[PDB]
Symmetry: C2
Subunit: 110 residues, 2 copies
């Protein structure tokens, strides 16, 4: 319950980083540290566990980057399904919020 809340919120934050453009682990981790004012310092193990599921479910794809450094670097991209699922999320959840303000309003009536 305290770990389940986080799981969703981490996943949400990570996918929004990939919304800003394709990225690789440390690029993501440093961006998250920055935008969360140091609160959320992500682990590589955590990020890869989450990314390994997301890739399986077709929400993100991985590809090899430019190797003009003399080394491998895995980039991550938000797929088509993942863009769509991200849109439906905002659609569903704003609808929910309309349904809730209607229940707070049906109180005022009754």
């Amino acid at each position: 319950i305290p770990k389940e809340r986080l799981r969703a919120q981490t996943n949400c934050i990570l996918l929004n980083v990939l919304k800003q453009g394709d990225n690789y682990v440390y690029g993501i981790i440093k961006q998250v540290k920055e935008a969360s004012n140091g609160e959320m310092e992500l682990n590589e193990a955590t990020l890869y566990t989450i990314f390994d599921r997301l890739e399986q479910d077709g929400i993100i794809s991985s590809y090899w980057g430019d190797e003009s450094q003399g080394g491998r670097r895995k980039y991550y991209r938000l797929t088509e399904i993942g863009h769509e699922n991200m849109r439906l999320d905002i659609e569903s959840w704003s609808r929910v919020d309309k349904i809730i303000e209607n229940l707070e309003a049906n109180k005022k009536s009754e």
Copy 2:
């Protein structure tokens, strides 16, 4: 994934009904039908499955109502833990949204 999104959103809507005051199945189902403009017509089986978990985890409590009708009627109440968990949710998720607008802003910088 399409069923997991709903599970969370149903749970959220149901707990907000119990925010408006203690209630019993059909009172809840009719209120949800109303505030969702007929879209969400809940099943008793569904509602009770969800409520049986929520009660186990201590988020809601059940009690017997007034029996001046000559019949049993189970009411449901949002517990202390459940009020707190509902507050933390809004706390965490608005923070998340700050973290996201910061990632959409760190783009504009870079």
